[model samples]
Target chain A: PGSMKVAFASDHGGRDLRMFLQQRASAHGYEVMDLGTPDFAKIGCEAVTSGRADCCILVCGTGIGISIAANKMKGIRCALCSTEYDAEMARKHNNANALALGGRTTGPEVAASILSRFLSTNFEGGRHAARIAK
Target chain B: PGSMKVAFASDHGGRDLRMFLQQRASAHGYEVMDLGTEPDFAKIGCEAVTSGRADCCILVCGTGIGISIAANKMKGIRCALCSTEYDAEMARKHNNANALALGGRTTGPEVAASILSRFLSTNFE
Candidate 1:
């Protein structure tokens, strides 16, 4: 089994949720790398851009802060998704390599549903590939 | 202004940024509808798709957040905020996002162009 590596992180605001998601991640068979707080956005982005992780799940107070940081990294396509539908697009249209969740605001069930879609969805590519390069 | 209408919107944070992108969009030969700042970025995007005023809409703000949150509230809207060209392409190809949001502070002109080319070309599969 070519396991997928998922990088996990959260700031102080999202620590608990990060731990919550971490517990369930192993059940799905993907390798989880919890970069811990403080480095939430920094390490997570590195893991994805460096190819150490197949995808990344990040958390911050509003999911906005961390995602903004992730987007600043080279080759990192991070999408802050507040809804499951947003998660669907993150993978489907954006080929998002990392997902940003609002730990303080996003409930566990909501995060789980969104996480499932993030992990499962694939990019349709087509004309999308050219843009990804830019 | 005749064939293929593209609705554009942005908040105060993305006004200058959207203006830059708006010109690039028009250069592509698509009819561009300048929503300016009226109705907010989110509502403008919704109006475009809902009113059939555009083939699709493009949105921009500081980070493409508030607008996306607003646009998705619409019944048939799927607004995708993209940081990279890959994300823009995927939005249309996989999720069939009718609206796209950009980060004015984060995205560059070259990056925006790459994102737009794929966004305008691809269809849902």
Candidate 2:
């Protein structure tokens, strides 16, 4: 069943996490767009920013590289989520448009738990929302 | 010969400035810390600190951005970006900044010299 569309990508650094999440999300009935390389992570970011997808999850070595690359696209707030708290805060406080994971550092169980938090939480913002571009 | 040791390094973005500054520091009578392990500015800086081979380090790159970010990653590194002699002097005088930075593209030659001389001469408070 086609459901909420999700864009996802990773580099060689995050291959395991990316692959695991793709399968996991599909089982959850969410539409999955798996952009298979670091270079193409931006396209996934654009898909969300352009409304072609609902949101994106990106991964790389330390979770920083893919996040940095994805955030390069305008208005896409990519947050590298290492802890459950980091994932929750990014979605709520930072209004993160994308979630980033470290394939090597974050285990499959943690990412799967974190992935749900990122998708479910909404920003705690009115004045804070204005703070993104400022 | 003075016992004071100084280390220097820069990324490709600051090659011209790094070479110029290295000679200037050497002329001022400090034993230069050479890079043998790698050409990357980040590696050179960490070695200078971890090896205990120098009293301090001078890091450079375009606008002092890349190298400082890198040097700060290592433990006990205190890299400070100083575009002026005042900034350099204050970094040592107050913060005990162990690594000084200059912008290759953003800083000028005269300003760099003044910053360097002051950065070297100033003692920690």
Candidate 3:
């Protein structure tokens, strides 16, 4: 009954956590695809915006670069989360379509929990839509 | 010279710390402009920079993640989420970030201020 598809993308600096999150998503029974690096962030955002994936996980040295690129896309709301609280809030309020992570900055344990929370949380809508409507 | 003009914005949950940082930036000699707060904050606040009214901006929300995502949605805005001074420094040095985001509920006042200082002082490498 689990048919959620999550895509993964990363540069050389982000590959470690990218692979780690990919393994976790696969173990959780979601359909996963590795989109690889080399202009990775842009392609990841495109994959989600085009409806090829339910969500995308983007990683780079700091997660800042990838997130900035992802969010620049017209319909992408990419949240750079270093903690579970950030991940949860992103999904609930921003309806984030992509999650960005810091490969070198975030620890695997914490990143794993953040990813879990991101996938589990739901957007609350209500007044939140007014903010996200732009 | 601390003449950098920094724009500040936040939603209801972020106003308290937003005010705190605004005062700090002012005291430090930067021309600080408070853009009020909203879910529509990221766009309006970021426009201050993109439209050439401000040099950089700081956005806040309950988790900072939501506002950050919104901030980056604007063209020419590179918003970075800050949890530490290092995050702030790297955001500017590496990403050339024009905006910084803070989690009012998640980050304490002192750490948030420190992060702001780093973002303000760092230059793009």
Best by DockQ: 3
For model 3, the stretches where C-alpha displacement exceeds 4 angstroms are: A125-134
Worst 10 residues of 2 chain A by lDDT: A63-72
lDDT of 3 by residue, B11-124 (tens): 887888999999989888889989996647767888999999999999877878877877887788899998889888999999999999888899999999999989999999
Q: For candidate 3, lDDT tens digit of each residue in A1-134?
A: 17788889988877778888889978988788899963788888888988999999887787887788888788899898988988888888789989988877889989889988988888898775466443
TM-score of chain B of each: 0.89, 0.87, 0.95
Residue pairs that clash (backbone atoms under 3 angstroms), model 1: A93-B90, A93-B91, A94-B87, A131-B85, A131-B86, A132-B85, A132-B86
Which of the CAPRI classes, incorrect, acceptable, medium or high, describes model 2?
Answer: incorrect
C-alpha lDDT values of all predictions: 0.74, 0.70, 0.86
Please state the Cα-based DockQ of model 2 relative to the true two-chain complex: 0.03
Which candidate has the top score in lDDT?
3
Ranking, DockQ, top scorer first: 3, 1, 2
Computed on C-alpha atoms, the DockQ of candidate 1 is 0.04
Which runs of model 2 end up more than 4 angstroms from their true locations?
A1-3, A127-134, B1-125
Put down candidate 2 lDDT per residue, A43-132, tens digits, no spaces. Answer: 778889888888888876545445444554677777655456556766665677787776766679989988877777777888664654
> Fraction of true contacts kept, per model?
0.00, 0.00, 0.80
Q: Give the TM-score ranking, best first.
A: 3, 1, 2
Tens-digit per-residue lDDT, B60-88, candidate 1:
77556545554664677777767566666
lDDT of 2: 0.70
